Amino acid sequence: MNIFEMLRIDEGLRLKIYKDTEGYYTIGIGHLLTKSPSLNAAKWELDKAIGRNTNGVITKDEAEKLFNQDVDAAVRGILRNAKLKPVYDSLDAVRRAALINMVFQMGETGVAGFTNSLRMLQQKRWDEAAVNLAKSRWYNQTPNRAKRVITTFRTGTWDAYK
């Protein structure tokens, strides 16, 4: 499996404008459109993103390519972070997947907030990291997802996704 596969399941797919847990206008595969309440703004963001007028409706194709960008964007931000870089450097191919999800789901900052989890990670202390990642709002809010993520960090296997 891979990050793509991984996040596809976590975020689902929707070719039409929808609302994320916070009341944010989103599309495709976790694609944040806007933070404005104006569904008119959310729409424009789209057409800007797609590069065509979409009347708020997209193709698999479009979602998937936006999906690719998002990730890479994600990826980039990590490499650019001082806190993350070293952790990401340290991981294996599966554990990174698991970090990237985190950054994707919450942004750079919120991931750099897990200070002690970041530490334990870097020290390869799996179990411990796990025990600690679970003591967050994150978990308490999207436990569903947080347990897959955590289990990944924990095992280094894709089991939580099989």
Cα torsion angle, 40, 45, 50, 53, sign: positive
Q: In what order do the strands lie in the sheet with 31-32?
A: 18-20, 24-27, 31-32
Q: What is the rounded CA–CA span in Å between residue 35 and residue 8? A: 22
Q: Which domains does the chain have, with CATH numbers?
A: 1-162 (1.10.530.40)
Long-range contacts of 137-141 (CB under 8 A, 24+ apart): 138/106, 138/110, 141/21
Q: What is the rounded CA–CA span in Å between residue 127 and residue 118? A: 13
Compute the radius of gyration of the chain from its Cα atoms. Answer: 16
- Cα-Cα-Cα-Cα torsion 126, 127, 128, 134, nearest 10 degrees, comes to 110
Query: Is there a binding annotation on residue 132?
Result: yes
18 burial type by CB count under 10 A (0-12 exposed, 13-18 middle, 19+ buried): middle
CA 3 to chain centre: 10
Q: What is the rounded CA–CA span in Å between residue 7 and residue 48? A: 23
Query: Is there a binding annotation on residue 38?
Result: no
- The helix/strand/coil state of 113 is coil
Beta strands in 30-152, from DSSP E residues, in sequence order: 31-32
The CA-CA-CA angle for residues 19, 76, 22, to 5°, reads: 15
Q: What is the rounded CA–CA span in Å between residue 133 and residue 112? A: 12
Query: Is there a binding annotation on residue 117?
Result: yes
Active site residues: 11, 20
Query: Is there a binding annotation on residue 36?
Result: no
Task: Report how this structure was experimentally obtained.
Answer: X-ray
Residue 91: which of 140, 14, 8, 101 has the closest Cα? 101
Q: What is the rounded CA–CA span in Å between residue 18 and residue 140? A: 23
Q: What is the rounded CA–CA span in Å between residue 92 and residue 136? A: 24
